[PDB]
Amino acid sequence: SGFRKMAFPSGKVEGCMVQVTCGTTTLNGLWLDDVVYCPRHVICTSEDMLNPNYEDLLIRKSNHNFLVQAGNVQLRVIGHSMQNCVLKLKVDTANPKTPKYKFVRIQPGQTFSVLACYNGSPSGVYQCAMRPNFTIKGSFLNGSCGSVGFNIDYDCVSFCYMHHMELPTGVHAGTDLEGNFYGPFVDRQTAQAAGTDTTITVNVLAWLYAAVINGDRWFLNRFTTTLNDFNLVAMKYNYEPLTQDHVDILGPLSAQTGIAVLDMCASLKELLQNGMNGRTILGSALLEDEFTPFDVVRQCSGVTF
Amino acid sequence: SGFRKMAFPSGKVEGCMVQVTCGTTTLNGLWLDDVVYCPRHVICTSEDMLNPNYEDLLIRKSNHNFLVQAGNVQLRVIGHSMQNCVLKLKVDTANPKTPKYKFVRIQPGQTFSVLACYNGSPSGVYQCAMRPNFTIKGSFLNGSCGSVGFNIDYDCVSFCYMHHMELPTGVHAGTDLEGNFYGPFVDRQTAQAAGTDTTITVNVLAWLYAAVINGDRWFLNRFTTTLNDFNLVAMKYNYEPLTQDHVDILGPLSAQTGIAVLDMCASLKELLQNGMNGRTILGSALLEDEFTPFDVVRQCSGVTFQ
Ligand SMILES: O=C(Nc1cncc2ccccc12)[C@@H]1COc2ccc(Cl)cc21
Ligand SMILES: O=C(Nc1cncc2ccccc12)[C@@H]1COc2ccc(Cl)cc21
Ligand SMILES: [Cl-]
Ligand SMILES: [Cl-]
Numbered sequence: 001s002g003f004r005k006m007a008f009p010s011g012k013v014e015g016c017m018v019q020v021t022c023g024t025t026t027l028n029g030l031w032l033d034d035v036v037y038c039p040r041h042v043i044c045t046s047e048d049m050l051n052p053n054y055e056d057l058l059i060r061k062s063n064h065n066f067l068v069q070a071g072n073v074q075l076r077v078i079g080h081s082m083q084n085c086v087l088k089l090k091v092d093t094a095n096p097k098t099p100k101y102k103f104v105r106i107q108p109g110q111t112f113s114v115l116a117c118y119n120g121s122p123s124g125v126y127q128c129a130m131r132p133n134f135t136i137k138g139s140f141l142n143g144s145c146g147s148v149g150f151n152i153d154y155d156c157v158s159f160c161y162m163h164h165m166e167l168p169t170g171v172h173a174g175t176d177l178e179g180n181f182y183g184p185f186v187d188r189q190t191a192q193a194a195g196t197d198t199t200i201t202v203n204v205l206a207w208l209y210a211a212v213i214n215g216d217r218w219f220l221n222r223f224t225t226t227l228n229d230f231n232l233v234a235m236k237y238n239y240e241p242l243t244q245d246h247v248d249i250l251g252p253l254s255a256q257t258g259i260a261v262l263d264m265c266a267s268l269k270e271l272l273q274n275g276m277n278g279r280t281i282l283g284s285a286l287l288e289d290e291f292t293p294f295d296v297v298r299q300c301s302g303v304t305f
Numbered sequence: 306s307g308f309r310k311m312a313f314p315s316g317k318v319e320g321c322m323v324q325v326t327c328g329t330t331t332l333n334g335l336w337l338d339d340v341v342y343c344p345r346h347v348i349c350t351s352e353d354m355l356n357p358n359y360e361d362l363l364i365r366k367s368n369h370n371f372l373v374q375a376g377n378v379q380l381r382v383i384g385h386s387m388q389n390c391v392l393k394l395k396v397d398t399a400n401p402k403t404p405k406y407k408f409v410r411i412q413p414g415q416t417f418s419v420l421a422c423y424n425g426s427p428s429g430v431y432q433c434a435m436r437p438n439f440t441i442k443g444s445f446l447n448g449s450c451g452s453v454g455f456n457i458d459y460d461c462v463s464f465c466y467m468h469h470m471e472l473p474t475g476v477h478a479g480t481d482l483e484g485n486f487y488g489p490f491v492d493r494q495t496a497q498a499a500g501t502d503t504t505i506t507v508n509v510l511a512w513l514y515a516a517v518i519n520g521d522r523w524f525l526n527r528f529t530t531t532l533n534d535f536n537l538v539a540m541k542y543n544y545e546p547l548t549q550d551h552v553d554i555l556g557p558l559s560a561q562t563g564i565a566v567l568d569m570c571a572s573l574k575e576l577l578q579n580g581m582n583g584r585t586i587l588g589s590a591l592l593e594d595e596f597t598p599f600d601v602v603r604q605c606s607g608v609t610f611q
Contacts, residue, residue: 001475002444006429009420011316115314122314124604125430137588139309141606170306170519214475283442285590302446304426 015097019120028146084179134183320402324425333451354494389484439488
């Protein structure tokens with residue numbers, strides 16, 4: 001019993017974190033095989049950040065300008081290149097702790113674990129979701145750039161996020177490991193803002209199924225709804241539309257609890273129109289949207305890595 | 306910016322998790338140097354659990370009755386002893402991945418990270434707190450016994466909890482790494498129940514200081530209170546009494562934000578009376594009590610967002 005916001009065990013990623021220094025700037029790097037990946041803004045001064053020409057700033061650097069530290073050992077940079085918004089530093093030593101891995105681009109609504117780092121040292125691990133507006137609600141201070149987000153599939157680590165910046169509302173923006181930003185953001189000190197966010201409907205439904213599995217049933221009702229009527233309600237409350245794909249994905253949870261997806265949608269509709277009336281669900285007075293259907297099945301079944 | 310429930314990186318603990326088997330029972334063990342620590346109830350059958358006599362059950366076992374598996378390698382047990390509710394199995398190989406460590410007994414209100422394991426394999430990591438009734442609100446299924454709780458302040462792992470059982474309300478009970486239970490619980494299947502739980506007041510205050518550091522002041526008021534008047538009101542909402550020790554511990558957060566502890570206590574009294582009125586604090590519609598004063602200082606910026 002119990003339901004917690006749970007992250008993947010971080011050990012396989014901790015053995016890949018290194019410190020990257022270029023001039024006065026220090027940030028984190030990810031060391032896989034003989035390459036260190038880090039945000040390309042490591043080569044910038046604060047004035048360069050106003051309007052940077054990264055190819056131009058980079059041509060002025062040599063291999064020895066990049067200091068890479070792995071624990072207490074200094075790594076030797078033997079090459080450097082840029083791919084989108086990521087800098088790739090070729091080093092002479094392959095990481096003996098390199099896990100089995102993949103680089104994956106995730107979609108909004110998908111969750112991942114973040115290993116927050118400072119000076120190449122891991123400080124904490126937390127779970128979060130790619131919001132529909134492509135930002136993440138992380139917890140990051142100055143020095144956290146280069147911290148990574150990941151999932152573990154079987155024994156393979158899938159790297160999906162690298163941290164680059166904080167927006168004025170305190171939310172965060174970054175790239176996949178191929179350097180492509182999530183969202184309409186750019187790595188430049190210029191006016192940028194997070195767009196209006198929405199709630200991840202399929203994830204709220206998954207969390208309601210987790211509450212039922214844990215013995216919380218006060219919100220259940222005898223009613224059902226159509227997908228079209230539910231989507232008209234969900235639009236009124238700034239909830240993402242629910243598709244037939246989402247309904248199919250919730251199938252196993254629907255069969256386990258005996259509550260059809262559109263039956264749970266009728267509970268969600270009543271919660272949106274009336275509130276919780278002083279009650280809580282899994283210790284929360286708000287509807288939680290940062291657990292996917294897969295996260296719910298994984299936690300309620302004890303899958304190991 | 307941001308404020309998240311954050312766990313310590315689990316790598317140092319993952320390299321210690323092993324699987325322990327005795328007959329038909331399988332659970333998790335913690336391998337440090339040449340000793341594997343696990344709950345003593347691994348020697349019990351389900352029928353033994355009502356009134357087990359662990360000394361009588363253990364004297365009947367030999368070293369080769371305990372199967373210890375570390376990854377794909379079978380470890381050899383060369384000795385066994387019991388200390389309180391923990392079984393200690395001496396093995397013929399020291400763990401090469403043993404971190405710098407300590408065994409610490411924590412007090413109610415303290416937080417720690419839990420590495421949930423099944424069959425000696427880690428499945429997830431989450432942040433927990435020792436409730437005032439000595440239970441923990443964990444997420445554990447059958448086979449999770451032996452999973453551990455820890456903190457890693459600086460480079461040393463301080464092990465503080467080993468999981469033993471689930472109570473009828475779905476909450477969890479366990480021991481320190483010396484085998485002493487937290488609370489009036491026993492490793493017996495006799496009728497046992499968690500006492501009435503209360504809210505950890507010093508932790509709610511710490512979390513309100515985190516909200517001020519991150520820029521939110523909507524809940525502050527022009528009032529102050531005495532410590533005694535605050536406690537009379539707090540106990541009516543099932544909040545733990547706030548002691549002078551708690552007031553002293555909140556000193557650094559008070560000095561950083563410029564809000565006196567008894568001034569923050571007056572805001573808490575008003576929140577308990579009025580509720581949030583459709584507002585949230587750090588993304589929550591409830592008052593959070595699983596962040597200590599130390600957790601807030603570790604996670605937050607040293608400069609308040611004025
Ligand atoms: O956002 C940035 N760093 C930070 C990241 N995460 C958290 C922070 C918290 C506080 C202060 C800085 C934080 C830098 C500063 O301004 C820019 C502009 C563009 C880029 Cl790509 C990167 C940065
Ligand atoms: O509680 C126990 N195991 C579990 C632990 N955590 C979570 C669970 C979830 C589901 C089912 C069992 C879970 C066992 C079964 O009954 C007893 C009685 C006493 C002791 Cl010391 C240990 C146990
Ligand atoms: Cl609501
Ligand atoms: Cl303590």
